[PDB]
Amino acid sequence: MDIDPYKEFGATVELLSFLPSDFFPSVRDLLDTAAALYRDALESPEHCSPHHTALRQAILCWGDLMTLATWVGTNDLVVSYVNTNVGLKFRQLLWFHISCLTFGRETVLEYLVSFGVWIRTPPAYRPPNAPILST
Amino acid sequence: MDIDPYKEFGATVELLSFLPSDFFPSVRDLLDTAAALYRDALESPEHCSPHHTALRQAILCWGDLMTLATWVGTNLDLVVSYVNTNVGLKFRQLLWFHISCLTFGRETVLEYLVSFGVWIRTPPAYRPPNAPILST
């Protein structure tokens, strides 16, 4: 029953939980990114790639969690849960789905492998720069 | 922001709000239905269709909501009979428009809503005595 959300795009959840927790940018920083960058691509009535569609259904859900966040939190422990346990795994989608349209789906799948050998190296002789998706 | 989930799939949220809210099948039936017809299709690494990848980014979201709902249900009328009132209606039709789509074709599903749409508002003294169904 556990349906992989990521098997369409090379990675798995543990190619995606491969990275640490707070390394992913915040949802307010990311939901304001796709509306900034890919505004006309999302509003368009054409499915212009299969990679665009899975980015769309997440944007309903963060609006759907806020339909559950405020409307339950109005009637100091729920707010801590929306950022850490379901929220962090929900925060994964926005970085991974935007970036494969940023610089390439195969680019982001190659982004992870160099990142782990950078970051699972302990701070004794970790190189000073991190690999970043470049121009 | 203003991203409705149907501009790429022919309908609107207005087009699916034409049906009465009770007509949609209940969610735990569709969980088996989504588990029925696409076991080796949803897990398969080939993305089948844009209709197919959206259900896979629907069952992950519906699992996240009831994750919190039972989680907040075990620490505090309040939750499950509460969340299934105002926004628990649309995640039925988010699923049902997708699970029924590529079983018969998107044009089959949209013309179904035309024919079943005109069938339900006309009074029963003059409509066809049955509703149409999914044929082919």
Add this chain to the structure above:
Amino acid sequence: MDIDPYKEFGATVELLSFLPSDFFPSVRDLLDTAAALYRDALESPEHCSPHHTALRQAILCWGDLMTLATWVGTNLSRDLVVSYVNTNVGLKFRQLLWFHISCLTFGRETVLEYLVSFGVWIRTPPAYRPPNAPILST
């Protein structure tokens, strides 16, 4: 002056009196049919038809009569006043809402042939007539 709303489109004002009062769907049940599957052809910058001329002016009246009728219950025996909008003046207006919507799903050649056949099923009294209603199709 004496201008019937159907003289161009092959009907008359008298042709729709064969249609009984319970044939048509309810107004609020029918007003969203233009909102159902006619959203493009009502809001395209080009008219898709002469039918979408009048149908675009169909809702334009209902956006004023009920706007008046909402104003009635604020400032005006009022139990019959707002219901009369739904009773007799609207019964002509419900005919206006259905017929233009009836075209684009079926064809105006279809609906004009439909009301001829529907007429004889209700011109004929219920002493000897088939109770199965003639449905609308191709």
Add this chain to the structure above:
Amino acid sequence: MDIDPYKEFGATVELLSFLPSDFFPSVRDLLDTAAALYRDALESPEHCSPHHTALRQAILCWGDLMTLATWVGTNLRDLVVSYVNTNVGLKFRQLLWFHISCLTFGRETVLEYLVSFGVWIRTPPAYRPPNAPILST
């Protein structure tokens, strides 16, 4: 059911907000105008253009307003009478005026009537000459 009255015919409903509510003639004048101008072009069993197709729909939707205000005025008062003249339903005074010139002077010149008016109606009366452009013929 947000359908603008004019998405099909050039102007938009924001564009008719240039016109003040003191510019339009009385509604009984335009019916007598449209009867005198296009008696043959409204009882006609055919349309040549959509511009005099919607004209009968306003006439069909003005007759019920005369029907209702007389019905609600002789069965119920001057507030409703002073309503129907200068209500939110000045729209039918608006709707009748726009479709007269589109048939009589083309859809093109009606937009050539209004934009010139918007410059003339907003410019202050210190330099605003009493020679407002009435329509070319």
Add this chain to the structure above:
Amino acid sequence: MDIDPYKEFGATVELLSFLPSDFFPSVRDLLDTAAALYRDALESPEHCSPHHTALRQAILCWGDLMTLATWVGTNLRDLVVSYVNTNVGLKFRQLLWFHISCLTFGRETVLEYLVSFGVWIRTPPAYRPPNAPILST
């Protein structure tokens, strides 16, 4: 940083000194004009001409003036309020009016509007007929 507002578009800033400061309409009218005229031609993701390219830059530079005068008026008064209407910053009332007619009537006819006005505005009122040339359509 002496950049004239108009070296690119025909007229010069000395040429707009013909126009008196009582001729221009109120600034709230032109925003409602430009929204009604060119809602589609300002939210557009492309430019067809530079004349409605600078129109959004005035709208971007009028919103801060509404922002600042409200901010400096609700945190500090009527002198600053009577400033921003008839200050040295009537320039944004000037800048908005010039770019409306260039898109709506061509860059050519805007110069065909102003030179005729300069003859009419300087000729004394003994022979100065109240029929000042409003724009051709």
Add this chain to the structure above:
Amino acid sequence: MDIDPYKEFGATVELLSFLPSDFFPSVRDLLDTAAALYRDALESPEHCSPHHTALRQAILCWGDLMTLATWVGTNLSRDLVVSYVNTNVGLKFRQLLWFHISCLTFGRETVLEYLVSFGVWIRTPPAYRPPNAPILST
């Protein structure tokens, strides 16, 4: 109405919020950049670009806001008033000054690709990110 100053030129108002407050040069340090090497393309009788449309109207605002702000210190707690022009309302306005100047030295195709790459360097928190700043070049 709601008109962002970048909808044509491939950016948004939200895209520049990734740029921090200390990225941009100081206003008086940047206002002469148009006076530096753009004197011809600001004062040519023909516009050299759609970029020099807005950039010619860039200084036109700063010739009025500071003209207002100079008038503030004459006739108007005034320690914060003129500084607020340099603090928050100007921070949008400093973005307007740099971006059009950013084009003609580099290309608008260059700068739009620049802010995408600059965004991820500041979307990423300083727990794990390279401290060498991505400079602007070809």
